[PDB]
Model the fold of this input.
Amino acid sequence: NLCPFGEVFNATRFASVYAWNRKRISNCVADYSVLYNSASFSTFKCYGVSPTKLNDLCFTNVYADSFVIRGDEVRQIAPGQTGNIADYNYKLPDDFTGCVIAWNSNNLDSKVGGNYNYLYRLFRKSNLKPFERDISTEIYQAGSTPCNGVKGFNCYFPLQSYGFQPTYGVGYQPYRVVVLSFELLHAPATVCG
Amino acid sequence: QVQLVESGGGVVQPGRSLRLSCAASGFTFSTYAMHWVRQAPGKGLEWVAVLSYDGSNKYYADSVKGRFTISRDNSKNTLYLQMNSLRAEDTAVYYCAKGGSYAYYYYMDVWGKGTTVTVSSASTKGPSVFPLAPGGTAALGCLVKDYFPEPVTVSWNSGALTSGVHTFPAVLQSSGLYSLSSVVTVPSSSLGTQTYICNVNHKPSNTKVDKKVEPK
Amino acid sequence: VQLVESGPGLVKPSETLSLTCTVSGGSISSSSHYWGWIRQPPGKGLEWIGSIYYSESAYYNPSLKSRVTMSIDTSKNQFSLKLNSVTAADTAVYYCARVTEPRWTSCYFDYWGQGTLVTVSSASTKGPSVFPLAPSSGTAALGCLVKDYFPEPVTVSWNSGALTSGVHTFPAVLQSSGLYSLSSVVTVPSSSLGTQTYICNVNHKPSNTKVDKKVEPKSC
Amino acid sequence: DIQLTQSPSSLSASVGDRVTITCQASQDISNYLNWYQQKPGKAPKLLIYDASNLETGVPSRFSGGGSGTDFTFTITSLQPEDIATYYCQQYDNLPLTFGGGTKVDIKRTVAAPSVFIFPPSDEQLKSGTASVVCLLNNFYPREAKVQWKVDNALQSGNSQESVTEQDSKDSTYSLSSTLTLSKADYEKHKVYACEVTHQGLSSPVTKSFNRGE
Amino acid sequence: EIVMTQSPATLSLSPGERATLSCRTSQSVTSYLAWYQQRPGQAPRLLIYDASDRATGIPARFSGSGSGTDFTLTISNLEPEDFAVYYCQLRSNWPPITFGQGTRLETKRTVAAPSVFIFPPSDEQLKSGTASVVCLLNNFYPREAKVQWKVDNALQSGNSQESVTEQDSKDSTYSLSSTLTLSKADYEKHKVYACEVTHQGLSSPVTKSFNRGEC
Ligand SMILES: *[C@@H]1O[C@H](CO[C@@H]2O[C@@H](C)[C@@H](O)[C@@H](O)[C@@H]2O)[C@@H](O[C@@H]2O[C@H](CO)[C@@H](O)[C@H](O)[C@H]2NC(C)=O)[C@H](O)[C@H]1NC(C)=O
Done:
C-alpha cells in the first residue's frame, strides 16, 4: 500500500557505519511529502534528482542505507568525498542519483558514561569501492613485522569506537544518516509517488 | 526486462577446462556486480563466485577457489567463468545473477535461465536393455543399464500400455554411466495372453531397442 | 568558578557516607561539563569516584560501583555523593571538581574544589596529652610530644607564634589504638636554655582543647 | 561462514492448512534472509526478500518474518501450485549460503508399498555382471528404507536407489533399488533378499529369491 | 587492562634545571593525557590537558610530549614553588579515568648529615602508665635514613612509628622523628635506650643513648 519509510527513519536502533544497513524498498507508493515538510533534518542534499519533483517519478527499486557517524563526518556522505568514513566505511559513486538525509541524534545515541556501541573503521589497505561493505575484524599490519592476530608494534585493531556523550561539540555528536538511492532499469517501475 | 543468457555449457572430461559466458542486456552492465551460482543434480544451491562492477575484485567459494576464474568484459556486456580442472562435483546447472549497485555483492536481483555442465570421462554409449521378468497382480519391467549421456525415453507397447507404468529417474553409477529402470504393474491373468515390450530410445547414441519381457 | 564540599566529617564503619558539593561560579545545568568526586587517602594517590551529568545518569569506578550512588539537584545548584558500607580504607580527602569531556579520551578536571577530610573510624574524639621533650643536659634540641588525640588535625606553635625559626612539626602517625600522635621540635642555641623560656601551644578544635606546655631542662 | 538450518526437511499438509517452516542462522544476519521456491525442473523463484517483504507477483498467501538468527516462512492457505522445495538464503556476508530446503507434499492416507524383487536376467549374466532389482510400488509417505541381504549378510555401498515424483492422481511414491554385483560374487551365494521398512507396514516386509529356480 | 605507571617515584633537582616526568601507558591504546600538580594540603591543579595543552594560567615553562603510549611532562626552568607531586590521568574505555602513581619533585642539594637527638619519656607521661622515647634526625639529605632502636642492645621492631617532614623551603633538608612506645612496666625492666642512625652523610652509624634513671 504505502512504502514503510517509518521502519528506516524511526528505527529504535541504528547500525554502525562500518556495517551500515540497507533496506530494499519495492512495490509501494512512496510518500516523500512527509520528508519535505518535516523541518527536522539537518541535511537533505539530493544528487541527480530534485526533492520537489519527486512525487511524480517512478523507480524500479529504492534502497535506504542507514548508519550513525559524528557531525564533522556528515560532509563525507557525498560523491567525490574523502576522509575516513568515505574511504573506509561508506563510499558513494561519483554519478550518484539519490538523496542524503541526516539529523542530530544526541539525545538518543549518547550515554552519560560513554556510548561505545557505535563503531567505525580506522585502518584499511585500500579505499572502499562504491557501496562496498567491509565488516572484517582482522588486525591491520602497519609495520615490517606481521601481526598474527595480536596487537602491538604497528598492529592495531581495524575498528574504533565513537565517544558519543552529551558534553561534546556538535562536530562530535552522533548523527543518523539515511541514504536513499534510486535505481532505474529497463523494467517496470514498482516504486512511484 | 533484464536478460541473462548463459552459453558454453556442455560435456568435458575431468581435468580439462571450460569457459562459460553470460550475456546481459537491459541495464548498465558496467555498473552492476555479477554472480555465478550452480546446483548439482538432486542437490541444493551453491554460490560460486562474484565480481565487482569493473572486474577488479573477485570472490569465490572454497569449493572452486584457485580452480575457477571469474572475469568480465564490459565492452561486450558479457560475464565469464573460466573453469579449470573440472571434477564430478562441478556437474551442475550454472546460473549468472545480477549483483548490487556497485561493489554491493550481497544481492541477486535477477537470475538467468542457466546452462548445464556435465563432467564425465565416459563417451556416448548405447544402453543395454535387460528384462525384469515377472499375488493377484504382477509387476514386470526393463533395466536400461550403462548408457551415456542423458536422457533416455521408455514406452510400453509403443505407447499402448500407460496405466501403472513407473519410469524411474536414472542414477549415476560409479563407472560414469547411467542406469534406469521402468516397470509396469499388470494383472496375473493376462501374463500368458498379452505380450509386453518396452521401447527404449537413446537419441545421443541413435539406439532404439524393443525388448520383450516374458515370464520364467 | 568555585566548588564547596559539605557533609559530616565522621562516618562509622559499615554505614553510608554522605557528602554534598555546592558550586557557585557557573551552572550545573550546563550541557558542556560533568561534575565528579575525587578522593585520596592521606599520603596516597588520587582515585576518581564518579562523575554525574545534569540529567540523572552517571558513571563511577568499578571498585566502589556497588556501594556508591550519586545524585544531582539543579534547583539548589549542587550535586551529592553517597558511599554505602564504608570501611576504614575510605579514610581520605574528598574533592569535587569540574569535568570537561569534548572528544573521547579527553577527560580533564578543570577547576578543583578545596575538599573535605572524612575520617572513618570508631574511635572517640579526645584531646591530646602534651608532654615535654626536655633539652638534654652549640645547638640544643627541645620539643613537645602531642600524643593520643582524635581526630585530625592539631596546630602547634612556639612562644605564641614568636618562635618559628628551626621549628619542625612532624606529620601525625595513626597509632594502633586509633588515636593520632605527633611531635614538634625546635633547635635553639644552647646558651639560651637558662635564660630564654620556651612554650609550645597545642590546639585541638574538635575537642576544644588548648594546652600551653613549658619545656624546661630537667634537673637531677 | 554463516550456516542456515531449515526445519523441517519435508512436511505434508492438506489444502488450506497453515504451513510454517523455520530457518535459523548461525549468527546475527539482521534481516538479510531470502526465501526461494523451486519446482522440480524449473529455476528457483524468489518469494520473500528482506525476511518480511513480498516479491512482485507473489500472492498474499505467502508471508515471512524474523530478525537476527530465527526466521519463519508461512503459507496461510495451501494451493496446488505450492508443491515445491522452499530454500532460505542469507546475504549478510559472503559466501552466500542457503538452507537445507523443505519439500511440501500432498497429505495422503498412509499406503503400504507393494514389494517386488527381480533376479538378474540370463542375458545380463552372459556379460559378467548381475543386477538384482527391488521394487516399491505405490506407497506413502516418501520415507522408506531398503536393506539388502546376500546369505544373511547385510549389504552396504553396492546399491543405488531412485524414486519417482508424487503421482498427480493417487499421491503415492514409488522406489527402485538396484544391487549391482559381479557375476563371480553372484555365483558364490544363493539367497538374495531386499527387506523393506515402511510406516504403513506394521513389520518389515522381506522378499527373497533363491538363485536357480 | 590499561595500567598506568609513572616514573620516577621521586625526582631530585634544583631551581634552574629542567625535569622530565614519564607516564607510559600499558601496551595498548594511545590518545590524550592530562597532567596535574598538587602541593601539600592543596587540591591538585590542572597543568596540561589533551596531551600537550597548557591550562588557563600555566607558565610557558610547562610542556608535554604527547605522542604514543609513553608521554612526558617537561618543566623548563624549575622555579622554587614548582616542587610538588605530579599525577598523569587517562580516560580509557575500562577502567575509565585511571590515575598515575605520582612523581614527587624535590629540591636536590649537597649530602647533609643528620643531627641526632634522643629524648627520654617525661615524668608526667610515666604517671599515665605509658613511656614514649623520641629520636630526632634533624636537617639531613637525602631523606633516605634508617633508625634502629636498641633496648639493652636488643634490636627493637614493631613498637615504633616514624614521620618525615616535607622539604624545608630554605635549606632543602628533611627531618625525621621516630617514637618508641612501651608500657611503663616494660620501660622499667631495662636500662640502656638508644637509637642507631645510619645515613649517607655518616661514615659510621651514629648512636645516641641514655640510661633510665640517670639525668
Ligand atoms: C517518525 O515518527 C514521528 C513521530 O511519531 C511518533 O511515534 C509513532 C510510533 C506514533 O506513535 C506517532 O503517533 C508519534 O507521534 C512522525 O511524526 C509524527 O507524524 C504524525 C502523523 O504521521 C503526526 O501526527 C505527529 O505530529 C508527528 N510528530 C512530529 C513530532 O512531527 C514521523 O512522521 C515519522 N516518520 C516516518 C518517516 O515514519
Remarks:
- Residues A 5-6, 9-10, 34 surround ligand 1 (CB under 6 Å).
- Chain C has two domains: 3-120, 129-215.
- The CA atoms of residues 40 and 46 of chain C lie 5 Å apart.
